[PDB]
Design a protein around this ligand. Structure first.
Ligand SMILES: Nc1ncnc2c1ncn2[C@@H]1O[C@H](COP(=O)(O)OP(=O)(O)O)[C@@H](O)[C@H]1O
Ligand SMILES: CCn1nc(C(=O)Nc2cccc(NS(C)(=O)=O)c2)cc1C
Ligand SMILES: [Mg+2]
Length: 857
C-alpha cells in the first residue's frame, strides 16, 4: 500500500551512467511503447568416483598432508619410530604417579572390560559398530585402546586415527580430555581441527579429533596415511555425518584394509549395520540404577505449585489427580518453559535429603540465561547452598570444564544445559534431571528466506536418554515438564537433519570431490533427503554460477567449495578482491561464523556500542569499526587488549577467533591465485567520505540478498514478501528510547530474517536505492516512470538509469566469471574493466542518491 519512493538522481550521474553503458557497448532494454505493458530490465566442461585411501607411511605427515624431509623422521625406519614411542611411553608410566592415578580411573570405566573384544572385532572387520549407554567411555577410551594396542605390540608407526565429532565443542573438548588422560596437552599423541582453529597431532602414532566439515574439506587428495576412521555419535543424525557415512561406505568397498568404527548410543542401529554390509555390533554396558520419572501433573502436585494469571495437552489430565493439580496445570502455556516450577522443583529436591547434582535440559542459551538470572534474584540460591553452572557451546572452555568439578558439602550443583548433556557428555554426581521436553532446531525456508530458531518437542527417545542421565550414580528422579497427554503425541524420533537442512554446501563437496551427480550421490544416503531440497541446492549453485548449464563445477564453484562459509558470502569475498576491499569483506564473512562481539545482554545497545556505527546506520560498519579499534589497542600487548575489551564491553575470545578465521579465508584466496595487495587491511572512517566503505556496503547488499526491507516508522519494517516485521532490539538502528531515527533512506539489508512471535531483521545496514537496484534486486519491471523491484517495492526513477544499473550488475557478474578463470587479472587493472568498476564505485556513494550522512536529517 506504499507510494513509489522518489530517487533523487542528478542529471550529471544519469548521463555518466548512459555514457559508461554506451562506451562498453552493454545491452539495455529500451523504454516501453505503452505503460500498461511494462518490460523486465534483466536479460562448459564434459560430464561416480571414490575417495582414494592409503595406509600410514614413516616419512609422511597425514595431518599436514606433506612429506617429512627435515630431521630424523625423514629416513628413520618404522621399527626405530615404534620402539622409541613404546620406550618413551613405558618410562612416562614408571615415573608419573599422577598419570598412574589417571590410568587407574580409566581402568574402572564400563568400556574397559570390553577392550579385548573391541580390538579383536576391529582387527578382523573393515567396519564395526560399538553400541552402549552414554558414559561407558566409547568416545574417550576406544581411540586410546587402538593406539596403545599398536604402541604395546611394537607397531606405533602403523597407527593414525581420525575421530569425527558432530560438534566443534566436542572435537576440541575430547582432544583436551584424551591428552590429559595421556599426561599431555594437544599437540603430541592427540590433536584437534575445527573450522577456523587446529592444534595438529605429531605425525606418528597419533589421534586427530575433527568436525566432519574439516575432514571433507581435506579429502581433495584422498585419505592418505590413516589406519582407522572412527565416526562418533552417529545416532545424532548430524547431516555432515550421514553424508560422510556415504563416502566411507564407497571407500570401504574399494579399500577393505581401512578400518571404520561407528559409535552409537543405545538406539536401534540395524539401519547402520545393514548399510555397512551387516557389520558386527559390539555391545558395551555397565551399572545403571532405576529412575522414577514424573510428568508436569506430578511436579505441580508434589510442590503444591500455583501459576500466575497444536491442541493444548495441559487441559487433559487424568482424574486420579487433585482438582487444584488439574486447574493449576490448565493455566500453563505449553509454548513456555515454567521457570517458577523449576525453582519449586529445586526446593522439593532439598527435602529428599539425598546429595546429588541437578541437570536441567533447556533448549538454548536464551532460556538458560533467563533461568540463571531468575535464580540469582532469590538469595535462597546463593553460593552458601548452590553452584549454578550454564552449559552451552558459546561459554568459554574454562567455564565448560567447571560442570565436572566437585562442590563443597551441603552445596547442590545445578547444570542448566543444552542437549550437549544428552548423549555427548556425562556429568557425574547427577541424581536429578529437570527436562523441559524441548529441542532447539534451525529451520530455514528458501521461499521466504526465513530463519526459525524453533523451540520444538523432543522425541520419546530424547526423554528416555535424558531420564537415563539421573541413573549412573544411585537410584534417580527425572521431572519431565510436559503433561502425560503431550508425551503420548511425541514422535518416537527427531527428523534426521538430512530431511530439513539446505544441501548446497554438501552439493559443492560432492562436486569438489568428484563423487558424481548431486542427486545420484544423495540417493545412496542411508536416508536420502527429499527431492525438493536437492532441486533447491542445484538451483542455488546454478544462480551463483558455481555450476554451469551441464551441472559441472565452474572455477567459481571450486573456490566456493574450498571456502568454509555460505557460498553467497564466498562470491561476495571474490567481488571484494576485484574492488580491492578483500580484507573488509573477509572480516564480515568471518564474523557470520561467531556470536556478536558486543556484550549487550539481549537489551538495547548503549552509547559506547552505538558510537562504533558512526553516521552509517549500519551494524556491519559498527563491527568493522570495533575490529579496527581492537586491532589498534592490541599493539599495546595482552593487558591493553584485555582492558580495551573490558572498558568497551567486548568479548575478546570472539574478536580473536574472528580475526583468525579472516586470516584463514584470505589464505585460501591467496592460494587460489588472488594477489596479496587486493586483501590488505585498509584504514577507514565511519563518519567522513570513504569510497572503500561505500563499496563494502554495496557488496554486503549482494551477500545477504534477498534480505531487503523498507522502514515504515519506529521499529516496523516491510519485508520482500510484503509482510510486517520489527527492527531487532540489538541493532544500532533500534531507537534507544522514544526519540525517532531520521534515516536518509528507508532501505535496509540485514544478515538474517528471524521468525519468533513476530518477524525480526537482525544485523541491519542502510543502503541507497541505487545499491538496492545494483546488488539487492533479482528482477526489475519498468513502465517508463516507475520500476517495480522483486514485486514488493516501487521506485520513481528514470527508466534509463535503472536499465544502466542492471547492465552494470550483468557486466560485474561477467567479470567475476573471467576473474575466477584467471584471478591475477585483478592485478592488470585493464582499463575497460576499471571503467565499469569506477561507475559501481560512484553509485555506491551516499552522494549519488542525494544523501550526505554528515548533515543531520
Ligand atoms: N572433561 C572431563 N572431566 C571429567 N570427566 C570427564 C571429562 N570428559 C569425560 N569425562 C568422563 O569420562 C567418562 C567417559 O565419557 P565418554 O568417553 O564421553 O563416554 P561415551 O562416549 O561412552 O558417552 C564419563 O564418566 C565422563 O564424565
Ligand atoms: C595443512 C595444515 N592443516 N591441516 C589441517 C587438518 O585438519 N588436517 C587433517 C584433518 C583430518 C584428516 C587429515 N588427514 S587425511 C586428509 O584424512 O589424510 C588431515 C588443519 C591444518 C591447519
Ligand atoms: Mg561419546
Amino acid at each position: 500500500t506504499v507510494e513509489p519512493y522518489k530517487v533523487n538522481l542528478s542529471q550529471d550521474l544519469e548521463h555518466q551512467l548512459q555514457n559508461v553503458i554506451q562506451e562498453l557497448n552493454l545491452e539495455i532494454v529500451p523504454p516501453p511503447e505503452d505503460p500498461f505493458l511494462p518490460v523486465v530490465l534483466n536479460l562448459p566442461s564434459q560430464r561416480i568416483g571414490v575417495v582414494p585411501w592409503s595406509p600410514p607411511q614413516s616419512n609422511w605427515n597425514p595431518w599436514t598432508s606433506s612429506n617429512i624431509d627435515e630431521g630424523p623422521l625423514a629416513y628413520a625406519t618404522p621399527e626405530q619410530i615404534s620402539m622409541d614411542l613404546k620406550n618413551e611411553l613405558m618410562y612416562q608410566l614408571e615415573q608419573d604417579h599422577d598419570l598412574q592415578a589417571i590410568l587407574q580411573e580409566r581402568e574402572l570405566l564400563p568400556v574397559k572390560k570390553f577392550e579385548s573384544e573391541i580390538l579383536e572385532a576391529i582387527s578382523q572387520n573393515s567396519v564395526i559398530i560399538i553400541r552402549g549407554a552414554t558414559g561407558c567411555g566409547k568416545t574417550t577410551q576406544v581411540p586410546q585402546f587402538i593406539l596403545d594396542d599398536f604402541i604395546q605390540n611394537d607397531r606405533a608407526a602403523e597407527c593414525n586415527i581420525v575421530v569425527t565429532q558432530p560438534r566443534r565443542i566436542s572435537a576440541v573438548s575430547v582432544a583436551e580430555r584424551v591428552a590429559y588422560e595421556r599426561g599431555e596437552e594437544p599437540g603430541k599423541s592427540c590433536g584437534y581441527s575445527v573450522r577456523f582453529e587446529s592444534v595438529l597431532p605429531r605425525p606418528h602414532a597419533s589421534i586427530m579429533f575433527c568436525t566432519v566439515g574439516v575432514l571433507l574439506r581435506k579429502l581433495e587428495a584422498g585419505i592418505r596415511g590413516i589406519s582407522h576412521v572412527i565416526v562418533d555419535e552417529i545416532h545424532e543424525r548430524d547431516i555432515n555425518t550421514d553424508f560422510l557415512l556415504v563416502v566411507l561406505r564407497d571407500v570401504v568397498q574399494a579399500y577393505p584394509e581401512v578400518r571404520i568404527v561407528l559409535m552409537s548410543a543405545t538406539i536401534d542401529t540395524s539401519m547402520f549395520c545393514e548399510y555397512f554390509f551387516n557389520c558386527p555390533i559390539i555391545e558395551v554396558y555397565g551399572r545403571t540404577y532405576p529412575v522414577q520419572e514424573y510428568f508436569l501433573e506430578d511436579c505441580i502436585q508434589m510442590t503444591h505449585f500455583v501459576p500466575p494469571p497444536d491442541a493444548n495437552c495441559n487441559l487433559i489430565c487424568g482424574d486420579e489427580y487433585g482438582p487444584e493439580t488439574r486447574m493449576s496445570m490448565a493455566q500453563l502455556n505449553e509454548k513456555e518453559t515454567p521457570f517458577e516450577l523449576i525453582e519449586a522443583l529445586l526446593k522439593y529436591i532439598e527435602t529428599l535429603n539425598v546429595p546429588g547434582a541437578v541437570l536441567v535440559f533447556l533448549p538454548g542459551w536464551n532460556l538458560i540465561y533467563t533461568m540463571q538470572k531468575h535464580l540469582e534474584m532469590n538469595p535462597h540460591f546463593g553460593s552458601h547452598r548452590y553452584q549454578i553452572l550454564p552449559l552451552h557451546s558459546q561459554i568459554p572452555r574454562e567455564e565448560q570444564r567447571k560442570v565436572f568439578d566437585p562442590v563443597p558439602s551441603g552445596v547442590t550443583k545445578v547444570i542448566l544445559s543444552t542437549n550437549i548433556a544428552e548423549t555427548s557428555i556425562t556429568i557425574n554426581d547427577v541424581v536429578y534431571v529437570i527436562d523441559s521436553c524441548k529441542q532447539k532446531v534451525k529451520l530455514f525456508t528458501a521461499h521466504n528466506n526465513m530463519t526459525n530458531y524453533a523451540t520444538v518437542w523432543a522425541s520419546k527417545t530424547n526423554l528416555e536418554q535424558r531420564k537415563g542421565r539421573a541413573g549412573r550414580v544411585r537410584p534417580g528422579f527425572c521431572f519431565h515438564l510436559c503433561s502425560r497427554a503431550r508425551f503420548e503425541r511425541l514422535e518416537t524420533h527427531m527428523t534426521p537433519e538430512m530431511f530439513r537442512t539446505p544441501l548446497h554446501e554438501i552439493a559443492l563437496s560432492i562436486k569438489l570431490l568428484r563423487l558424481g551427480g548431486i542427486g545420484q550421490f544423495l540417493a545412496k544416503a542411508i536416508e536420502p533427503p527429499p527431492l525438493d531440497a536437492v532441486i533447491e541446492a542445484e538451483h542455488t549453485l546454478r544462480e551463483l554460477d558455481a555450476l554451469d548449464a551441464n551441472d559441472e563445477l565452474t572455477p567459481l564453484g571450486r573456490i566456493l567449495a574450498k571456502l568454509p562459509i555460505e557460498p553467497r558470502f564466498g562470491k561476495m569475498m571474490i567481488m571484494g578482491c576485484i574492488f580491492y576491499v578483500g580484507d573488509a569483506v573477509c572480516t564480515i564473512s568471518a564474523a557470520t561464523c561467531f556470536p556478536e562481539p558486543f556484550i549487550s545482554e539481549g537489551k538495547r545497545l548503549g552509547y559506547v556500542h552505538r558510537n562504533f556505527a558512526g553516521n552509517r546506520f549500519s551494524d556491519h560498519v559498527a563491527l568493522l569499526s570495533v575490529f579496527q579499534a581492537w586491532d589498534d589497542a592490541r599493539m599495546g600487548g595482552e593487558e591493553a587488549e584485555i582492558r580495551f575489551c573490558e572498558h568497551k564491553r567486548l568479548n575478546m575470545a570472539t574478536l580473536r577467533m574472528t580475526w583468525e578465521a579472516k586470516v584463514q579465508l584470505k589464505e585460501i584466496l591467496i592460494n587460489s591465485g588472488f594477489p596479496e595487495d587486493c586483501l590488505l587491511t585498509q584504514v577507514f572512517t565511519n563518519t567522513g567520505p570513504d569510497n572503500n566503505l561505500d563499496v563494502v556496503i554495496s557488496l554486503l547488499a549482494f551477500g545477504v540478498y534477498p534480505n531487503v526491507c523498507y522502514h515504515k516508522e519506529k521499529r516496523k519494517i516491510l519485508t520482500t514478501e510484503g509482510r510486517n516485521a520489527l527492527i531487532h532490539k540489538s541493532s544500532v538502528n533500534c531507537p534507544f528510547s522514544s526519540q525517532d531515527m531520521k534515516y536518509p533512506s528507508p532501505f535496509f539489508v540485514f544478515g538474517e530474517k528471524i521468525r519468533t512471535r513476530a518477524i525480526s531483521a537482525k544485523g541491519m545496514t542502510l543502503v541507497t536505492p541505487l545499491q538496492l537496484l545494483l546488488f539487492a534486486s533479482k528482477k526489475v519491471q519498468s513502465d517508463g516512470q516507475i520500476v517495480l523491484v522483486d514485486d514488493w517495492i516501487r521506485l520513481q526513477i528514470s527508466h534509463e538509469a535503472a536499465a544502466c544499473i542492471t547492465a552494470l550488475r550483468a557486466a560485474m557478474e561477467a567479470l567475476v566469471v573471467e576473474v575466477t578463470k584467471q584471478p591475477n587479472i585483478i592485478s592488470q587493472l585493464d582499463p575497460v574493466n576499471e571503467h565499469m568498476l569506477n561507475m559501481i564505485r560512484q553509485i555506491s556513494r551516499p552522494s549519488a542518491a542525494g544523501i550526505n550522512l554528515m548533515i543531520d536529517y
